[PDB]
PDB file of C-alpha atoms in Angstrom:
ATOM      1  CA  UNK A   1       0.000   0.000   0.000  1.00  0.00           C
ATOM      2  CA  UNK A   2       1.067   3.832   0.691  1.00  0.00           C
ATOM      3  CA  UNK A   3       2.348   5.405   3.829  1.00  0.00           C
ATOM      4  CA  UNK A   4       1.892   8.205   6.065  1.00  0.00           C
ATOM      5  CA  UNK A   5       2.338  11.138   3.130  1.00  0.00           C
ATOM      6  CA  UNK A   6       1.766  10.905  -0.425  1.00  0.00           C
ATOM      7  CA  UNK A   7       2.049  13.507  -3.181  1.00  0.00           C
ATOM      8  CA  UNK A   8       1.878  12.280  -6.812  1.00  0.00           C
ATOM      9  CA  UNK A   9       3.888  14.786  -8.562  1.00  0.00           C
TER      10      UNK A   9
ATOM     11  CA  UNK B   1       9.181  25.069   1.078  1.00  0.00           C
ATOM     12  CA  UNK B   2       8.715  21.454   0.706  1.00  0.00           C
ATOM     13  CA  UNK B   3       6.216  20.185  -2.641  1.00  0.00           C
ATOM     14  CA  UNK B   4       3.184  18.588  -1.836  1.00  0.00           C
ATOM     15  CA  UNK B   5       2.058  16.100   1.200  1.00  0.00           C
ATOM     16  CA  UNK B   6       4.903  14.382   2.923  1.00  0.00           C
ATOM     17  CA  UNK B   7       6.118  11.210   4.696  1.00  0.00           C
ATOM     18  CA  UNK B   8       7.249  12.497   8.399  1.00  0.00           C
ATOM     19  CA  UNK B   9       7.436   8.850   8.883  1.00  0.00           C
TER      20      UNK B   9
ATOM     21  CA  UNK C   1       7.553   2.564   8.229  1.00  0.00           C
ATOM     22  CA  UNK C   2       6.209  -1.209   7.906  1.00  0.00           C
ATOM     23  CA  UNK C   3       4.743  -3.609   4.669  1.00  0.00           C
ATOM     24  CA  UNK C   4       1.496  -5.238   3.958  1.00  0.00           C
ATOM     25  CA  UNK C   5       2.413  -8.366   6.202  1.00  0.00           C
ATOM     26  CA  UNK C   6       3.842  -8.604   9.490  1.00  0.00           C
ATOM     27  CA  UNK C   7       2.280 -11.020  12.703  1.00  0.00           C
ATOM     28  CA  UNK C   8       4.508 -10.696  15.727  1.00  0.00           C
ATOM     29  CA  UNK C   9       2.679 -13.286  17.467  1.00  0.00           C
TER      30      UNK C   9
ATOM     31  CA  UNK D   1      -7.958 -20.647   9.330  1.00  0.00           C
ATOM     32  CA  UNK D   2      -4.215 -18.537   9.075  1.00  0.00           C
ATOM     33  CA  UNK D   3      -1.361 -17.729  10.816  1.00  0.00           C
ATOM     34  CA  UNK D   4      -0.821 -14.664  12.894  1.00  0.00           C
ATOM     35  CA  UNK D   5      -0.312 -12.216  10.250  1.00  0.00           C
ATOM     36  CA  UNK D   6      -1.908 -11.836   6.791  1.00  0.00           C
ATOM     37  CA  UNK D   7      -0.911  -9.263   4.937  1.00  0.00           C
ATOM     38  CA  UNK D   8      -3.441  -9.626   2.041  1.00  0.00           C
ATOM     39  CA  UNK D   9      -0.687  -8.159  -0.544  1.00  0.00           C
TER      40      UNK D   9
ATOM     41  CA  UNK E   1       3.028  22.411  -7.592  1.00  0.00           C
ATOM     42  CA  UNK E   2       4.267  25.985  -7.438  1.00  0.00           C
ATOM     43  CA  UNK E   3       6.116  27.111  -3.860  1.00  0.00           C
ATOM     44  CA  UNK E   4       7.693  30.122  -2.874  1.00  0.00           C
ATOM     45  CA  UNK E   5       7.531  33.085  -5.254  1.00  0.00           C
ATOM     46  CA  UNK E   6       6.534  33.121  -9.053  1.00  0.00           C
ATOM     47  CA  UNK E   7       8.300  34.863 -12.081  1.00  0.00           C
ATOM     48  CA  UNK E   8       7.665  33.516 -15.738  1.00  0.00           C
ATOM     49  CA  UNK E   9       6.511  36.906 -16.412  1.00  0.00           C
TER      50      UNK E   9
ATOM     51  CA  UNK F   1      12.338  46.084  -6.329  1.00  0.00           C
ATOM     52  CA  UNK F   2      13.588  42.957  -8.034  1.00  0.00           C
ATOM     53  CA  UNK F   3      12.651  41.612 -11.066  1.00  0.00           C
ATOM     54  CA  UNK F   4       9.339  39.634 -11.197  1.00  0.00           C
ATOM     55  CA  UNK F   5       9.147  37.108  -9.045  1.00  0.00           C
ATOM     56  CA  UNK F   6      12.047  37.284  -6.993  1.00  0.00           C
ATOM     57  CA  UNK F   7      11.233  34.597  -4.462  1.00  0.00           C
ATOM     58  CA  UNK F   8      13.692  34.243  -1.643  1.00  0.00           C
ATOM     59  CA  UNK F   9      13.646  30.656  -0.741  1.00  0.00           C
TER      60      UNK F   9
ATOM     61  CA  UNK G   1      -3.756  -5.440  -9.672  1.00  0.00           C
ATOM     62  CA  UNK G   2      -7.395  -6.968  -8.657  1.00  0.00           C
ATOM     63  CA  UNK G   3      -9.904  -8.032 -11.385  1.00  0.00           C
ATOM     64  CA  UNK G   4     -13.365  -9.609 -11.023  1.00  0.00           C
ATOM     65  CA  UNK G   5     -14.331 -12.694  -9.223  1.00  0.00           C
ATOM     66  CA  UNK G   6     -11.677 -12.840  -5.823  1.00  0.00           C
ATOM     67  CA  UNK G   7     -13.194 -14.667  -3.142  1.00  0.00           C
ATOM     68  CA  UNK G   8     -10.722 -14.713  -0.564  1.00  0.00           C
ATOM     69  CA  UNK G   9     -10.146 -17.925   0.097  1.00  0.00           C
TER      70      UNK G   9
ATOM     71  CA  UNK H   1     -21.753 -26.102  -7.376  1.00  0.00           C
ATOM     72  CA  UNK H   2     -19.039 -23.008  -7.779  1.00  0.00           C
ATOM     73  CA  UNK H   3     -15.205 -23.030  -6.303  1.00  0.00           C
ATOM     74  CA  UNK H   4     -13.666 -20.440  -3.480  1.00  0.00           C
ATOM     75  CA  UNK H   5     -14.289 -16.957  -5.241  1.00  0.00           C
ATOM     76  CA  UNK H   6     -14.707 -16.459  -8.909  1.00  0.00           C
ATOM     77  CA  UNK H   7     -16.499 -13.796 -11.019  1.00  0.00           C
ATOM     78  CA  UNK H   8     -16.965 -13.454 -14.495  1.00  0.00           C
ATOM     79  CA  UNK H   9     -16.004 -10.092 -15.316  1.00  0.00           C
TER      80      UNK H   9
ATOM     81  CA  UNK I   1     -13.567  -4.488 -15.907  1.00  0.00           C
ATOM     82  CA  UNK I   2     -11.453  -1.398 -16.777  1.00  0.00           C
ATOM     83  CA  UNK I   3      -8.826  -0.584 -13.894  1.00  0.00           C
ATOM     84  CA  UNK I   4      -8.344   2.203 -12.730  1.00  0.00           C
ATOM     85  CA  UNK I   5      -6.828   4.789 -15.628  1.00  0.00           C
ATOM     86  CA  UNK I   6     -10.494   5.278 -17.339  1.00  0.00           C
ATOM     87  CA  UNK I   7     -10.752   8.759 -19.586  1.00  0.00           C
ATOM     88  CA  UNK I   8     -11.596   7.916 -22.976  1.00  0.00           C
ATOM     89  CA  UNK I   9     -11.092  11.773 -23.465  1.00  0.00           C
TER      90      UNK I   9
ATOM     91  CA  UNK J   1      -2.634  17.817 -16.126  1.00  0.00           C
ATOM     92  CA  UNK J   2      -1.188  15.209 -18.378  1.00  0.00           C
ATOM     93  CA  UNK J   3      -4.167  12.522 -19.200  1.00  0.00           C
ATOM     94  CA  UNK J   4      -7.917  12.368 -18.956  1.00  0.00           C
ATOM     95  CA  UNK J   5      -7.015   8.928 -17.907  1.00  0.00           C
ATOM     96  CA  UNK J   6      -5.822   9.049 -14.951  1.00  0.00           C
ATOM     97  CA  UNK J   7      -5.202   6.179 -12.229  1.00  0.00           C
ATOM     98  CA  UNK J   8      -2.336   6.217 -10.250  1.00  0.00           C
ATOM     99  CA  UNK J   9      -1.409   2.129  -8.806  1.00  0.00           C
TER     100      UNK J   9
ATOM    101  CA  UNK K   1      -9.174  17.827 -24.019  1.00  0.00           C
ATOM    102  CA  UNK K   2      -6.537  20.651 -25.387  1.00  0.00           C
ATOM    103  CA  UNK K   3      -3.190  20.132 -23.747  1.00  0.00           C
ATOM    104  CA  UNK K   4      -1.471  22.800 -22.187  1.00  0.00           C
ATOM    105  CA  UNK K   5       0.171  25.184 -24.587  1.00  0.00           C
ATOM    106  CA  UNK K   6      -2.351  25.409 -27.180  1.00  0.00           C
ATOM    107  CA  UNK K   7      -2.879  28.961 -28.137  1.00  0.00           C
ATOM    108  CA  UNK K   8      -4.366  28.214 -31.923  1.00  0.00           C
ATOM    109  CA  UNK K   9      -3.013  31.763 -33.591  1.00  0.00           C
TER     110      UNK K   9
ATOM    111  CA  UNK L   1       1.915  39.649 -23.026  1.00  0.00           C
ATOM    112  CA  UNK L   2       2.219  37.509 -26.429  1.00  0.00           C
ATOM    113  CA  UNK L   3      -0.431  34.985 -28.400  1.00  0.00           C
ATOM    114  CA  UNK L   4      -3.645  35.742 -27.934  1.00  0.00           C
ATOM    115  CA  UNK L   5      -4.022  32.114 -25.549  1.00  0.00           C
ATOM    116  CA  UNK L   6      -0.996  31.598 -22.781  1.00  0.00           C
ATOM    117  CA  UNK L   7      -1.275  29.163 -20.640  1.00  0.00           C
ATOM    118  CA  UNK L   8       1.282  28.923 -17.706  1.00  0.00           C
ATOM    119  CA  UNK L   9       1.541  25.854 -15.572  1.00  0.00           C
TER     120      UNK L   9
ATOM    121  CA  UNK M   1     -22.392  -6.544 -23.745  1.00  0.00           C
ATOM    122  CA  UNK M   2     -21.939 -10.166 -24.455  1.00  0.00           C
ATOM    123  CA  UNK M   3     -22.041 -12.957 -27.045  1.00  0.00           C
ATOM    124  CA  UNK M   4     -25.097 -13.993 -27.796  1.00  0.00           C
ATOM    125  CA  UNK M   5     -24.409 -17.841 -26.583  1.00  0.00           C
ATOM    126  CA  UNK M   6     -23.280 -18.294 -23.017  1.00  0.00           C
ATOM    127  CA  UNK M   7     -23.667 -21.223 -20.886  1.00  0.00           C
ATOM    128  CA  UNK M   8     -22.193 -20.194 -17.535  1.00  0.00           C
ATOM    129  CA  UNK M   9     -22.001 -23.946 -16.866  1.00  0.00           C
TER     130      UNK M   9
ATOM    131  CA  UNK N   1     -13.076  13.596 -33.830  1.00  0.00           C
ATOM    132  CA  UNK N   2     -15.163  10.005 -33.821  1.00  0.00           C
ATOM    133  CA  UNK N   3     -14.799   7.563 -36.566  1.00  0.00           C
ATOM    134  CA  UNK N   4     -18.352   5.611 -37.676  1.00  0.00           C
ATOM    135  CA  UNK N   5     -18.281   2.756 -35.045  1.00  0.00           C
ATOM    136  CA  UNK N   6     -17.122   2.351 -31.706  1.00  0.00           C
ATOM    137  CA  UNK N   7     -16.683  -0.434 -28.837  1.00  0.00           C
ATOM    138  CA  UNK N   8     -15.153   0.207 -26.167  1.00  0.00           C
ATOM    139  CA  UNK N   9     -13.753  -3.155 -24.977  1.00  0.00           C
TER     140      UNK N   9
ATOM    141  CA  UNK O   1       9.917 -17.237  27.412  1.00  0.00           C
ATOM    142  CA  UNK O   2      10.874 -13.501  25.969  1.00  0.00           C
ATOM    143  CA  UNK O   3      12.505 -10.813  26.890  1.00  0.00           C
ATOM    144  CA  UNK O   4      11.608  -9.763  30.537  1.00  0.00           C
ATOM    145  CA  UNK O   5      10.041  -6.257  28.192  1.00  0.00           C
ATOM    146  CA  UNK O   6      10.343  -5.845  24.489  1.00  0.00           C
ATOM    147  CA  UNK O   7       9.608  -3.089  21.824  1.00  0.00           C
ATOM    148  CA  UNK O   8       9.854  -3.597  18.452  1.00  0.00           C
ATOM    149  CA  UNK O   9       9.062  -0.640  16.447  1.00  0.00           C
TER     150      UNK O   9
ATOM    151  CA  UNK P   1      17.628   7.927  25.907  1.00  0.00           C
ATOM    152  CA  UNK P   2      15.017   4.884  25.717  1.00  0.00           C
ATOM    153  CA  UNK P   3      12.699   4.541  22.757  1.00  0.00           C
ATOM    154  CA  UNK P   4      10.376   1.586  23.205  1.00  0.00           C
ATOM    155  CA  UNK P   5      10.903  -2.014  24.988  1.00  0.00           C
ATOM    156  CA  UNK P   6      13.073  -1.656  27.689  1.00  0.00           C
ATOM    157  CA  UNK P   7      12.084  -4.814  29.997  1.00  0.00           C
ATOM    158  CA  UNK P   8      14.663  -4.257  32.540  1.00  0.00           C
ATOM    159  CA  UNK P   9      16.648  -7.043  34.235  1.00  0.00           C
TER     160      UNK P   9
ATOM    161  CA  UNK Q   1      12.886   5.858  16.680  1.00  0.00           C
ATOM    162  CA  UNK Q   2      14.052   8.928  17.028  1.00  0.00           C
ATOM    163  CA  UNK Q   3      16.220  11.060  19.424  1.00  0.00           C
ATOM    164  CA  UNK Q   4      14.069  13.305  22.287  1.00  0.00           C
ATOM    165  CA  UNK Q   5      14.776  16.496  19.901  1.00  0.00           C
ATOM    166  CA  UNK Q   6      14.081  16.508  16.092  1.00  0.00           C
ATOM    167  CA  UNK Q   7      12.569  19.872  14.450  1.00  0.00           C
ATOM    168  CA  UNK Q   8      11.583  17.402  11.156  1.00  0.00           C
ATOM    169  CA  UNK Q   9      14.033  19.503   8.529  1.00  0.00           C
TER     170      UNK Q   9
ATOM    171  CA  UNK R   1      20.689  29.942  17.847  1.00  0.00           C
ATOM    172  CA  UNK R   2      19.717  26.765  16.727  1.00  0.00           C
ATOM    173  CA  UNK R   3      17.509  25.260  14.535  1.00  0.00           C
ATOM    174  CA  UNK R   4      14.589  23.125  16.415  1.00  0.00           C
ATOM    175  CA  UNK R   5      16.031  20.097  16.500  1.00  0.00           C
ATOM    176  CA  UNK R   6      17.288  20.583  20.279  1.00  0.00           C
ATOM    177  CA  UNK R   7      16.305  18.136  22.751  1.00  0.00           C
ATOM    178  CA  UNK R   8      19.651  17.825  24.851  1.00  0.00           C
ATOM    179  CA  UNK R   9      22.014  15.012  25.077  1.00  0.00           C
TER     180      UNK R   9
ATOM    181  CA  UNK S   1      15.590  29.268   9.371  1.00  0.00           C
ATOM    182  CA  UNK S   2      18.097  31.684   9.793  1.00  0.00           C
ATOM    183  CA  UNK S   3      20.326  33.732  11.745  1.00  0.00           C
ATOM    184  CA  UNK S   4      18.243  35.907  13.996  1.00  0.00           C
ATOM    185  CA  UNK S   5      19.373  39.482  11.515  1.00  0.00           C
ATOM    186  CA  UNK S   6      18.142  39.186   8.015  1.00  0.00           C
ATOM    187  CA  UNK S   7      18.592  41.145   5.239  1.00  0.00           C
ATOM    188  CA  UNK S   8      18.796  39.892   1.667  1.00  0.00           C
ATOM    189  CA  UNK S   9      17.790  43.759   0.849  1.00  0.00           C
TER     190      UNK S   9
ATOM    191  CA  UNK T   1      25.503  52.222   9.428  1.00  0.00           C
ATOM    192  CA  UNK T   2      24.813  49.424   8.085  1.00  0.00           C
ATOM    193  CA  UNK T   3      22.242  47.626   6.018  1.00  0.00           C
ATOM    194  CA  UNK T   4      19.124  45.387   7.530  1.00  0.00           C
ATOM    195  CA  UNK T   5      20.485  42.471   8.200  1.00  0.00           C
ATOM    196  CA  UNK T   6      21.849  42.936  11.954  1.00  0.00           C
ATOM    197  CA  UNK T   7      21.631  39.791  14.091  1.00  0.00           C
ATOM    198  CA  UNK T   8      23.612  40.853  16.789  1.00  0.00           C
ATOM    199  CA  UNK T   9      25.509  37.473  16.648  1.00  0.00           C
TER     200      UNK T   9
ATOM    201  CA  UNK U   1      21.850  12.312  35.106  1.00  0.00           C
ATOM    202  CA  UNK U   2      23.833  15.650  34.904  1.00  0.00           C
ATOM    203  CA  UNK U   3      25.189  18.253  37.225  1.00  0.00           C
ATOM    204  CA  UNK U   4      23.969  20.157  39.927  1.00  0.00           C
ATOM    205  CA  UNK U   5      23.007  23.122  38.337  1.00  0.00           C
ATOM    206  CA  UNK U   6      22.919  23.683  34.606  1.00  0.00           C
ATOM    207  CA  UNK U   7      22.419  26.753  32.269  1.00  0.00           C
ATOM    208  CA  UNK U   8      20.384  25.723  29.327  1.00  0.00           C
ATOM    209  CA  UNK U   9      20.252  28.797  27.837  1.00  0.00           C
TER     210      UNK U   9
ATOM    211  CA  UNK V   1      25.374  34.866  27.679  1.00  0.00           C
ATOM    212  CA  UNK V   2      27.169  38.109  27.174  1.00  0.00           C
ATOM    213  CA  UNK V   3      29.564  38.552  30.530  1.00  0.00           C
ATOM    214  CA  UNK V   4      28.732  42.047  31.544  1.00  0.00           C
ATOM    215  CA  UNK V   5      26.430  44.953  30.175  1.00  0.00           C
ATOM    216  CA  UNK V   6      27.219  45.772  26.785  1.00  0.00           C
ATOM    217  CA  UNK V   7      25.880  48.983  25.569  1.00  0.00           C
ATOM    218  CA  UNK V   8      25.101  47.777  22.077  1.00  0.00           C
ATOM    219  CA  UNK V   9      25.599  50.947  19.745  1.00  0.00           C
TER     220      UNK V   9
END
C-alpha cells in the first residue's frame, strides 16, 4: 500500500 | 518550502 | 515505516 | 484458518 | 506544484 | 524592487 | 492489480 | 456447485 | 472491468 | 494535467 | 481535451 | 503579453 | 455486452 | 473527432 | 519465554 | 535515551 | 525511533 | 541559535 | 531558518 | 551604518 | 543524570 | 550569555 504522506507529482 | 504532502514517517 | 504483512505473534 | 499475520498483498 | 515566489513573467 | 518574481527561498 | 471474481479464500 | 471466489467479469 | 486509468477523453 | 485517464497504482 | 500550450493563432 | 491564448503551468 | 451464446455452466 | 463505429472493450 | 520487556518498532 | 521495549533485568 | 529532539528539517 | 532540533544530550 | 538578523535587501 | 540584516551574533 | 546546576540557555 | 552589560551601539 502507501504510507503516512503521499504527493503524486 | 517542501512540494506537496509528505512522509514524516 | 512497515509492509502489507507482518504477525509478531 | 491462518497464521498470525496476513498481509493480504 | 508551485512554492515560494513566481516569475515567468 | 527585483525583477518579477524574486522569491527568496 | 485486482480483477473480477476474488473470493478470498 | 461453484469453487472459493470467482467472477466473471 | 477497466482498472483504474479510465478517460476515454 | 497530463491525461484524462488518470489512475495512479 | 486541449493540452497545455495550445494557443491556436 | 504575447499569443492571444498563454497558458502557464 | 456479451455474445449472444453463453452457458455459464 | 469520432470515426463511424465504436466499442469500447 | 521472551525478553523480561520488548519493543519492536 | 530509551525509545520503546526496555524490559529491565 | 528517534532522538528526544528533532525539528523534522 | 539553533535550529529546532534541540532536545539535549 | 536563519540567523536571527536578516537582510537579503 | 549598516544595512538590515543585523543579528547581533 | 547531569550536574547540579545547569544553564540551558 | 554576554559577561557584563554591553551597551550595544
Amino acid at each position: 500500500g502507501f504510507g503516512n504522506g503521499n504527493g503524486f507529482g
